[PDB]
Amino acid sequence: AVQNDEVAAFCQSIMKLKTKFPYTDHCTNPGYLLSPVTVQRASVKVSIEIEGLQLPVTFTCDVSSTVEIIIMQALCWVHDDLNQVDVGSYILKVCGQEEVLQNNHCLGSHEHIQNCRKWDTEIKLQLLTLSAMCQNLARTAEDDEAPVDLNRNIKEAWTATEQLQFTVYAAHGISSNWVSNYEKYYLICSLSHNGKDLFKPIQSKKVGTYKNAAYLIKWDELIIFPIQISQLPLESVLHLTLFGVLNQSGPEALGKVSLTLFDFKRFLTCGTKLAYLWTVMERIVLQVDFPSPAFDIIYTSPQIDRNIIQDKLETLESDIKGKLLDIIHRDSSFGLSKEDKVFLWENRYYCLKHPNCLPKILASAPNWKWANLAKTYSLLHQWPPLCPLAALELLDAKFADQEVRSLAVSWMEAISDDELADLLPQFVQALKYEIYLNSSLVRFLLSRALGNIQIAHSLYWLLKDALHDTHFGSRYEHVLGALLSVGGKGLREELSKQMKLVQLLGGVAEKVRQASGSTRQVVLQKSMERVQSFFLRNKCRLPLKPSLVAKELNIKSCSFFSSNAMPLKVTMVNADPLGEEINVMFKVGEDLRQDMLALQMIKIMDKIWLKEGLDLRMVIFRCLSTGRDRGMVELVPASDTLRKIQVEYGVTGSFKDKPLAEWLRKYNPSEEEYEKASENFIYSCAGCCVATYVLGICDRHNDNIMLRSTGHMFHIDFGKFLGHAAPFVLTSDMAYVINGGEKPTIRFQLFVDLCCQAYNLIRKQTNLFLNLLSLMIPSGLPELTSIQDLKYVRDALQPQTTDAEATIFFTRLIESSLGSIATKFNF
Numbered sequence: 001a002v003q004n005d006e007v008a009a010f011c012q013s014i015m016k017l018k019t020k021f022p023y024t025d026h027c028t029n030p031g032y033l034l035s036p037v038t039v040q041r042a043s044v045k046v047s048i049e050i051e052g053l054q055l056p057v058t059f060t061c062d063v064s065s066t067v068e069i070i071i072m073q074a075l076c077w078v079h080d081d082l083n084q085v086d087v088g089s090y091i092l093k094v095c096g097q098e099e100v101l102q103n104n105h106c107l108g109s110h111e112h113i114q115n116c117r118k119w120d121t122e123i124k125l126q127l128l129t130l131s132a133m134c135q136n137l138a139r140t141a142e143d144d145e146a147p148v149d150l151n152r153n154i155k156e157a158w159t160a161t162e163q164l165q166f167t168v169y170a171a172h173g174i175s176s177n178w179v180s181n182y183e184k185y186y187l188i189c190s191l192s193h194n195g196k197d198l199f200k201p202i203q204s205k206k207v208g209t210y211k212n213a214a215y216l217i218k219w220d221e222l223i224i225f226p227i228q229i230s231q232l233p234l235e236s237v238l239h240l241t242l243f244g245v246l247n248q249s250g251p252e253a254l255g256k257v258s259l260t261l262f263d264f265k266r267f268l269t270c271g272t273k274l275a276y277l278w279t280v281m282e283r284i285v286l287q288v289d290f291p292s293p294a295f296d297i298i299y300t301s302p303q304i305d306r307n308i309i310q311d312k313l314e315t316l317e318s319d320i321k322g323k324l325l326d327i328i329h330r331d332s333s334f335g336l337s338k339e340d341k342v343f344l345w346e347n348r349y350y351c352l353k354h355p356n357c358l359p360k361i362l363a364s365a366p367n368w369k370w371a372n373l374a375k376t377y378s379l380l381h382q383w384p385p386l387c388p389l390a391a392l393e394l395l396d397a398k399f400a401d402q403e404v405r406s407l408a409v410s411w412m413e414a415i416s417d418d419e420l421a422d423l424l425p426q427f428v429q430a431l432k433y434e435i436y437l438n439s440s441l442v443r444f445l446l447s448r449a450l451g452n453i454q455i456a457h458s459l460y461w462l463l464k465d466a467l468h469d470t471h472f473g474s475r476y477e478h479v480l481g482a483l484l485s486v487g488g489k490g491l492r493e494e495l496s497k498q499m500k501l502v503q504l505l506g507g508v509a510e511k512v513r514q515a516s517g518s519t520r521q522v523v524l525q526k527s528m529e530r531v532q533s534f535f536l537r538n539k540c541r542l543p544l545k546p547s548l549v550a551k552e553l554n555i556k557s558c559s560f561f562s563s564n565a566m567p568l569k570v571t572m573v574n575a576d577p578l579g580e581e582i583n584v585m586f587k588v589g590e591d592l593r594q595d596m597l598a599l600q601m602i603k604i605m606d607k608i609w610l611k612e613g614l615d616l617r618m619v620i621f622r623c624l625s626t627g628r629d630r631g632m633v634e635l636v637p638a639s640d641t642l643r644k645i646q647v648e649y650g651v652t653g654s655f656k657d658k659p660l661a662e663w664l665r666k667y668n669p670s671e672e673e674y675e676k677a678s679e680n681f682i683y684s685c686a687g688c689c690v691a692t693y694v695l696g697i698c699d700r701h702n703d704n705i706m707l708r709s710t711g712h713m714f715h716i717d718f719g720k721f722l723g724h725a726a727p728f729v730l731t732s733d734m735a736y737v738i739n740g741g742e743k744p745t746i747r748f749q750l751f752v753d754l755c756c757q758a759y760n761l762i763r764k765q766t767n768l769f770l771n772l773l774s775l776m777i778p779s780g781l782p783e784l785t786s787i788q789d790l791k792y793v794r795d796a797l798q799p800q801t802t803d804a805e806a807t808i809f810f811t812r813l814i815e816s817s818l819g820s821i822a823t824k825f826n827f
């Protein structure tokens, strides 16, 4: 009955958000995907199709020049004098791909450009105007005008002395497999804020089902906490963990319930409140009765302190300033001893010069008591703006305060769509630490989605994948409903076709696995015919890369890889005849979400390196979980497992060093071509080695390691992630490729330099990797479950030590990985 009120006011806020994104604004409503930029620290051939020219124009562009000047370098090839064409109208799309280049960005800073250079493929763009560039996704006047629908006494609280108490009445609708399995049941009640218990939990008494009511458990027990309303922060949560002692022939948790002690309008919970814990998907109703005074108790925030605290200061230098600087320059807040905490908290007004340390300060607060909020808030308002990545820590569970979080979101406005897009999973998890449906965060994400179609696309797939969390399933239903609503008729119809495609592909995969031995191909062709029927009545965009528009299935290219998963090779025809055909893997019966995380962490190491001008030539491939234990995976062309290389070589010749080199000589015959390709191997192997050690991917064998024909090395099956007890292994044929001989060369010295440089550049961002892995804890991936799992990664990243002693540390890992051939080299 406030739940309906809360939703109603959300919708009101979301209508008001929409008014800032009118259909007419091409900036915020372009109707097309933007080709992604990743800002980079020389020259290239671009081929541009031009309307009314039989041949496309090919010329050299300074990779450093802006798409804007390139657009008319290309009008200068057809037009001798360009006053009689409006350059503004013209845009540049990638051939085959309904994605448009960003005028005010470098050519070199586009993902599509960096990728072509890496693979040495033809950059193929199309010159065209806004009028002729597909806009089927654009929002309409109807969409903007349309409504938002989804899928008296006053005591203040600081004066309220009433002790927090409530009666756990009953649970209703317990299944009959429960009434057999367990005799008695019991609730563990837990009171928390900032993700931590305020008091030790209180157990209810142990009670069986009520007389003549096998669907009902009745406790009718008053529970009293040793705390009064005054002492409860606004974001205080109640957690009733229902448990069940097994009948003869340790009681198991049967479900959890969340209950905010205040509601969205700051009023304390009064009266009877119902919550729903889910077990299949069957709905049990828990009745908690809170007191009903004649009066409403409302949380009021303290009186604001306007004092501005600078100018004259103690400026003591007894090494106390040095110790403060030491903890300011500490990698992170992780491991920070209670002593380091009080020290910071006192010299906090001296730290005002180093904005990105605020998280250490807030985590070193003595408490979040009403009294002390006034001085913590004063600081926050005079505090300088934080880097968006630094602010991310302030949306973790640790900081539940609504002013901290809302201010973290204001600093984050600074971030580019292009960087947020690779950070969306973390942001979708953080939504579990907003106790209220409306919040600065969900408005920030919904407003970014309105303004940028890649972000709306990715939010879609990530919210759908969060619906499956039984505890937060309802929160995410309302966030999804608001996104789908505010996205328009255009966006939703493509997302429906996209949903429809993945479901059919999943059906096909299930049936192919069910089919046994021969006739598996015949089953694939028969099941694929329904997808053939689906494309006959629909053009559809590819979920993995919605820039690609499939129109048709190519059945004779459609295949199944030979594996326990039996993944399918889905080949599709591009709807643009300027395009190349579409190849993806659809895999069923593996939870891809962890594969997705490995990839993201690798991609962020890439970006960190590119930032500092280090290019390790990394293969960056996409993976999307479409539901639970299924999704679509990018296929890398002209690549093969290490195993398969060694096997092929084993048939002719018995030299262990020769196989990788012989495979690369076959696809790169010229000495220059072989050199270019072994150098791609040096660089990409180095990135792979660093990534393997930091992320703890210790599972690397001849099957997990892949090799593109161009020389680039990469990993595919991230089965073991953050693994505990040489973390990477360099075989003798890997060594041969880097040396380019069986004796060592300065190419091996280039390999170690690259490993160490790249390693230090990741250690300088230790705090980003920790925040990005903590924010994924609530996601329920098996080997990322506690704040201990992070410590292994921090341990691997060795942050106390200089770049000098880290370089010695990693160089010793390389000596160790070489195993027995290590003796051939000099360290």
Ligand SMILES: CS(=O)(=O)Nc1cccc(-c2csc(NC(=O)CSc3nc4nccnc4c(=O)n3CCc3ccccc3)n2)c1
Pocket: 561, 562, 563, 569, 580, 581, 582, 583, 584, 621, 633, 634, 635, 636, 637, 638, 639, 640, 641, 716
């Ligand atoms: C310009 S174009 O459009 O015409 N070329 C193009 C474009 C896109 C894709 C393909 C394509 C078709 S088949 C393929 N893959 C291979 O050649 C190597 S196999 C393999 N590659 C993996 N890449 C990544 C992530 N994962 C994988 C994985 O799992 N595999 C399968 C590994 C395997 C080996 C042996 C038995 C079972 C599974 N790319 C072409």
